[PDB]
C-alpha cells in the first residue's frame, strides 16, 4: 500500500501539457507526440521522506468539443491540478478562466493544490504573455505561476523541481 | 501460381473486377470481408464505400465530375466568398505535424498541405461538428492507400517513406484529395453523433461495450468494477479513432478491408465496431485478470499489438462477426 495522488493536467490544445506530463514522468522530452485523444494515463512513483506515493498524471486532450463531452467525468476523486497555458500564445492564457469554472463546477473540492505552468519559454521572440500578467492572474486564484520549457534541455531540472514542488505539496495532506 | 496463396487470390479479384460492364457488389463484399490483396485496395475500398460506381462505363465521367467539385470548393474556399474560420483552420494546423509522427509520409509538407485542405473542406462542410481531433487520424488510412494505386505493385511497400511530389503531379495529387474528401466524407456519415457537441454516438458507444462486455466475460466486468476501472478510462479512444490509436497503420487498412465491406450499403458501422472493441479486450482478459488498476489503464492504452499480422486481426473480426450473430437480441 502506497497512497495514490491523482493529479489532472489540463489547457488549450498544443500548450504542451503531454511534453510535460512525459518530462514528469520520465524526464524526457517527447519529440513527436500525437494529438491526445480523450484522456492518457501515466504514473510515477515518489520516494519522499522514506514515504514511497504514488503519482498517477491524467494528461487530458484540450479541445473545447471533448472539454464539454467528458474531461468533467475524469475529475473525480483529483488530488491536484497543473493548469498549462503556451506563453507564445496569449488566447492560451485567456482560456484559463474557463478552464478553472469547469474545474469549480465539476467537482467537490477547493482547498485542493494546484499550480499555473507557462510552457515553451524558450520560444523568446515569440512570447505573449509577460509575467507580471501571468502572476496577477495566478495570485487572484491563489495559486503558484511557473515559467518553463518542457524541450529546452537547460531546463529540465527545473521541470523535475516544478514537478517536486507538487509531490512535496500532497505528501504534506 | 495456382499454388502460390497471394497470386491465386488476386486472381480472384481480377475475376470479380476486370473486364466487366457492371461489378457485382455482393460478389465483391464476400471476398474483401477476408483481406484485400494491396493491388486492388485503392479501387476496392472505392467502389465498397459507394463511391466509385459499380456500372464501369460510369466511372470515368463520376471522378471527372468529383474532382472538378473538389477542385471548384478550393477554389471557393481561399476566395473573398468564403470567410476563413480560424480557430478551425488552426486546430487542423497543429494537428497535422502531430499526425502519424513515425510514419514519414506526415511529415512531408506536400502531404501536410493535401491534409490540410481535406480536413478543412470537411470540417466547413459540417458545422454541426466542425473538426474534432482524431479525425486527421481517420483521413490517413484512405490517403495513404489511395496513394498506392499510384505506385507499381513492386514500390506499394515504399509507400510510406515516398514523397508523393516525386511520382504523382501536382493535378493527381488534387486528383486522389477529391477521392479522400469524398471517401472520408463516407466514413463520417456513418458515425456523426460521434463528434457533435458532447459526443453523445460515442458515450452511447462505450456503455454498449460495457453491458456486451458484461453479458460475454462477467468475470472481467467485475474486476474491473473491484478495481474501479472505468470504460471511457480506454474506451473513448478506441471509438473517436477506431482503434486506429491501438494498432499499426498495417493492421487498421487490413482491417478497413473487412469495416468496409461489412458496412457497403450488412451492419452498421458503430454496431460492428463495438463488438470488435469488445472481442480486442477479451482478448486479454486472462492478463487483465491480474491486474490493478494502474496496470489495466497503462496497458488498455498501450495494448501489445506492434507485432500483429493480418491474420491476428483476421481471427479477431471474425470473432467479433460470430459475437454480432449470438448476442444479437441484447439492448
Ligand atoms: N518549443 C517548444 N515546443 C514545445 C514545448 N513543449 C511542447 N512543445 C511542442 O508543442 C506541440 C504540442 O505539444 P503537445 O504536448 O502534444 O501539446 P498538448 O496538446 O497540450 O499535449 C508539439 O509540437 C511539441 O513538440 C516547449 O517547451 N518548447
Ligand atoms: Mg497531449
Known sequence: ?173 | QELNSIIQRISKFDNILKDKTIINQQDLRQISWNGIPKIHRPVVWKLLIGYLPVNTKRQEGFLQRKRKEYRDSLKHTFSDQHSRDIPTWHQIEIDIPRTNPHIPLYQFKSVQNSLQRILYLWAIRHPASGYVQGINDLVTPFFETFLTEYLPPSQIDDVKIKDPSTYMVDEQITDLEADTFWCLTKLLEQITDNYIHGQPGILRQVKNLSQLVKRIDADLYNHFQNEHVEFIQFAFRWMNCLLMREFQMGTVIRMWDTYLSETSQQSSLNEFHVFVCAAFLIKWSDQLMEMDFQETITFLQNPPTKDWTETDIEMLLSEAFIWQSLYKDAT
Not at chain 1, 7 to 19: A, E, L, Q, R, Y
Not at chain 1, 58 to 69: L, N, Y
Not at chain 1, 150 to 172: C, G, Q, R, W, Y
Open chain 1, 1 to 173: 500500500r502506497s497512497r495514490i495522488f491523482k493529479i489532472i493536467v489540463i489547457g488549450d490544445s498544443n500548450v504542451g501539457k503531454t511534453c510535460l506530463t512525459y518530462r514528469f514522468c520520465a524526464g524526457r522530452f517527447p519529440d513527436r507526440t500525437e494529438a491526445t485523444i480523450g484522456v492518457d494515463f501515466r504514473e510515477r512513483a515518489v520516494d519522499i521522506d522514506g514515504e514511497r506515493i504514488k503519482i498517477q498524471l491524467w494528461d487530458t486532450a484540450g479541445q473545447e468539443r471533448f472539454r464539454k463531452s467528458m474531461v468533467q467525468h475524469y475529475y473525480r476523486n483529483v488530488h491536484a491540478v497543473v493548469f498549462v497555458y503556451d506563453m507564445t500564445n496569449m488566447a492560451s492564457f485567456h482560456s484559463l478562466p474557463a478552464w478553472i469554472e469547469e474545474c469549480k463546477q465539476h467537482l467537490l473540492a477547493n482547498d485542493i493544490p494546484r499550480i499555473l505552468v507557462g510552457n515553451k519559454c524558450d520560444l523568446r521572440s515569440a512570447i505573449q504573455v509577460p509575467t507580471d500578467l501571468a502572476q496577477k492572474f495566478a495570485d487572484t486564484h491563489s495559486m503558484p505561476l511557473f515559467e518553463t520549457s518542457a524541450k529546452n534541455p537547460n531546463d529540465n531540472d527545473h521541470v523535475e523541481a516544478i514537478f517536486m514542488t507538487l509531490a512535496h505539496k500532497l505528501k504534506s495532506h
